[PDB]
Design a protein around this ligand. Structure first.
Ligand code: B12
Ligand SMILES: O=C(O)c1ccc(O)c(Br)c1
Ligand code: SF4
Ligand code: SF4
Ligand code: NA
Length: 700
């Protein structure tokens, strides 16, 4: 695979994006002319996704405008900084291309707010579609504009809400609900030119759709593209992406892989029938959802401060607040548990192997980074819900598991526990829930029960589904599985369904031996919650059990950031998507003799250091509905020194298997103070995986 960037973007600020837009011919003004956005080249049937992406577009539309917070005294004045931060925000949310332009009278003369002076214009590129005759082509053909419009409305809604929380009135616009001329503003903002009355954007050869945020929050404006002639898209500096931008050949190369195979070469990873760590199904107890340690925090199980902060701790930052409406209001759409009657829509559904390819292709078309399929085994479902305490049924046969990359470049400039951490969680959560909600809907359209499991509402535990779907291995981080290509830098989304699909197999890329020689995540955890010792048996399976009490307490309670994810950032597998980055992963997998060296040089080269160029976000904590400067400061952590050579023997963590959890049926209205002394003793008594294998063998 030769599409990886040759050159690093480590010195490229995020407001510049992944495309070398700063190398295109531009001029101060251009004469406006009629233009429409690109459209599909075919129509969509009743077999098609179309109805579902339109529903979610309509849902996001109700968050294009909303309440405006009081103006604090911490919002930077400089329009240039405002421009970069908002541009970077849009790229964070996966805009393909971003620009800014000034609104003039003719725009404010419509239903648009008359106090609006500037427009943030962004484009999202059409998704890749299955080739004719491929599995799922009928589900997708003709849905690209609506599909891309949904994504635009999403981003517009988040960004508009983001500015509104900084105290500035703002309004999102897209084809489905726009008060301004979208095409006209895209040309003025320098994203596109006009060919035969249709917009044409450089680099976005697949087509695109637009979104816009109009606001009185003043921004530095960009300049339109040179109206005629070659823009320089194929100049040598741009073709090779010398500044760390998308190579000029990557599109043509990527488009040679079948869409259902995803972008990362998972087909090259070794497969095994059973996971690389022991799983003893007959010994795995199901856990009350009330045993979720956030649910425990919420009920008072972890003290009053954890209970107080449980609601706000991930919403301290205005960007995450812009995502909350979408997150919470997608929940009522997650799907059904009852059996459905196959409706005859969706084409030929008799080949489970073709069904899996269509589902994977469908996920990648919608924005997933990884798709895997496994059976939703009953021990993967929670025993009981946390609100009413009623039993949860194992109501679906299959689990579709998708990984959303949390974002390398943002995490590179962060501490892992500063004011953007929860925003990296919530973005991946918001994006996965959207994609999974759309896919479950389509399954239900075809007459196959399906329900998604999101951050706001899940009835399965994602982890074992990530394992069985072959998307990660057990890693030292504990409650996080590690993928060979994006390491631990992910949020998973799962949706269960009865749609017959061929399942994937667990993967084996050598991580057990690698984590056995590595301690970086454990060394860098601010509250020492990650284990330095051997794997233990836990509720019937082998795992590195982190101390989930200490982690929960720190994420909900620490006041120099919003939550934490520092362990993802520090892991050596958290790497840039470069030629040398992939090769370091390749070597880690194929050359065991080189692992110790890679683990050491990761420190010697100061990997994990904060890259100040990538720190694009504002430090804003919302207190009493008003964004202000962080009341207590901001985490700015740097590489830490070794703990003892004896820390694996001395560190003592608490574990909470079902025995030390709220029993099935317990609700949030009961309180069960965390029995830490019992969790410490429990951990000391945990069977070692070696003893479990001996014990199982004696009944084989
Ligand atoms: C609440 C919660 C936490 C809590 C508490 C978890 C807990 N154990 O109580 C803390 C602990 C606060 C937490 C921490 C983080 N977690 Co969290 N956690 C959750 C959440 C929402 C609940 C887990 C749960 O069901 N209850 C707790 C009970 C079931 O815990 P348990 O009995 O000890 O079992 C745990 C593990 O043993 C594992 N597991 C259970 N059965 C089996 C069986 C096998 C064979 C294996 C291998 C594993 C496994 O799953 C449980 C995860 O907590 C899930 C989301 C979800 N719906 O699953 C994620 C989730 C697992 N965590 C996730 C992440 C990303 C994080 C963080 C990195 C935060 C961040 N910035 O992203 C940190 C890392 C923590 C670490 N050191 O590993 C991701 C992991 C994805 C992945 N790639 O593996 C999840 C899946 C959310 C998601 N949608 O992606 N979060
Ligand atoms: O319930 C919450 O507040 C919550 C749930 C999931 C999650 O990843 C985070 Br961060 C917070
Ligand atoms: S284990 Fe928890 S507290 Fe420690 S670095 Fe990871 S997210 Fe932060
Ligand atoms: S930091 Fe090292 S030990 Fe921790 S998960 Fe990553 S590779 Fe494994
Ligand atoms: Na790293």
């Amino acid at each position: 695979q030769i599409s990886m960037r040759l050159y690093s973007n480590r010195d490229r600020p995020n407001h510049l994006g992944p495309l070398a837009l700063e190398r295109l011919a531009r001029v101060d003004d251009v004469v406006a002319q009629p233009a429409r956005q690109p459209e599909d080249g075919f129509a969509a049937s009743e077999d098609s996704l179309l109805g579902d992406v339109e529903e979610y577009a309509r849902l996001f539309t109700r968050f294009l405008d909303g309440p405006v917070a009081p103006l604090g005294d911490a919002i930077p004045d400089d329009p240039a900084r405002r421009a970069e931060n908002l541009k970077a925000s849009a790229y964070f949310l996966d805009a393909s291309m971003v620009g800014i332009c000034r609104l003039d009278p003719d725009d404010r003369a419509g239903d648009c707010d008359p106090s609006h002076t500037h427009a943030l214009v962004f484009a999202v590129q059409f998704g890749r579609e299955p080739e004719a005759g491929e599995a799922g082509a009928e589900w997708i053909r003709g849905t690209n504009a609506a599909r891309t419009d949904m994504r635009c409305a999403e981003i517009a809604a988040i960004l508009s809400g983001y500015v509104r929380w900084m105290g500035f009135p703002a309004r999102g616009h897209f084809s489905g609900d726009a008060q301004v001329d979208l095409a006209r503003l895209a040309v003025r903002a320098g994203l596109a030119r006009v060919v035969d009355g249709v917009l044409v954007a450089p680099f976005l050869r697949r087509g695109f759709r637009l979104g816009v945020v109009t606001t009185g929050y003043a921004l530095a404006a960009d300049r339109p593209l040179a109206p005629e002639g070659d823009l320089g898209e194929t100049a040598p500096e741009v073709m090779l992406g010398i500044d760390g931008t998308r190579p000029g050949w990557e599109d043509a190369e990527e488009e040679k892989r079948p869409l259902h195979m995803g972008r990362y070469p998972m087909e090259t990873i070794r497969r095994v029938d059973e996971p690389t760590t022991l799983v003893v199904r007959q010994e795995i107890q199901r856990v009350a959802k009330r045993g979720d340690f956030f649910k425990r925090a919420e009920a008072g199980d972890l003290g009053e401060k954890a209970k107080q902060e449980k609601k706000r701790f991930p919403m301290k930052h205005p960007l995450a607040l812009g995502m909350q409406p979408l997150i919470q209001n997608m929940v009522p759409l997650q799907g059904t548990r009852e059996k459905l009657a196959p409706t005859g829509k969706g084409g030929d559904l008799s080949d489970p192997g073709r069904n899996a390819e269509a589902i994977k292709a469908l996920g990648y078309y919608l924005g997933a980074d990884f798709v895997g399929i496994c059976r939703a085994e009953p021990w993967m479902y929670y025993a009981s819900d946390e609100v009413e305490g009623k039993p949860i049924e194992a109501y679906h046969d299959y689990a579709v598991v998708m990984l959303i990359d949390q974002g390398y470049e943002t995490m590179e400039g962060a501490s892992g526990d500063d004011w953007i951490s929860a925003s990296q969680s919530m973005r991946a959560y918001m994006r996965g829930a959207e994609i999974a909600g759309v896919m479950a809907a389509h399954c239900r359209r075809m007459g196959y029960s399906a329900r998604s499991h999101s951050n706001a509402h899940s009835e399965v535990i994602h982890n074992p589904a990530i394992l069985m779907a072959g998307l990660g291995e057990v890693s030292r981080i504990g409650d996080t599985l590690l993928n060979p290509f994006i390491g631990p830098r992910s949020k998973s989304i799962v949706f269960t369904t009865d749609l017959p699909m061929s399942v994937d197999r667990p993967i084996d890329f050598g991580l057990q031996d690698f984590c056995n020689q590595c301690r970086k995540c454990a060394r860098e955890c601010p509250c020492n919650a990650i284990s330095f010792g051997d794997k233990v048996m836990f509720n019937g399976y082998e795992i590195w059990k982190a101390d989930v009490e200490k982690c929960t307490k720190y994420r909900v309670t620490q006041m120099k950031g919003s939550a934490c994810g520092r362990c993802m950032k520090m892991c050596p597998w958290n790497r840039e998507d470069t030629v040398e980055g992939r090769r370091l992963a390749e070597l880690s997998i194929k050359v065991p003799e080189a692992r110790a060296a890679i683990i050491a040089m990761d420190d010697a080269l100061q990997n994990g250091k904060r890259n100040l160029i990538k720190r694009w976000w504002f430090d804003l904590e919302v207190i009493d509905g008003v964004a202000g400067a962080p009341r207590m400061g901001t985490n700015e952590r740097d590489l830490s020194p070794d703990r003892g050579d004896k820390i694996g023997a001395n560190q003592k963590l608490a574990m909470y298997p079902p025995r030390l959890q709220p029993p099935p049926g317990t609700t949030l209205d009961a309180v069960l103070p965390v029995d830490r002394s019992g969790g410490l003793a429990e951990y000391a008594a945990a069977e070692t995986p070696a003893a479990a294998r001996a014990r199982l063998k004696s009944s084989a």
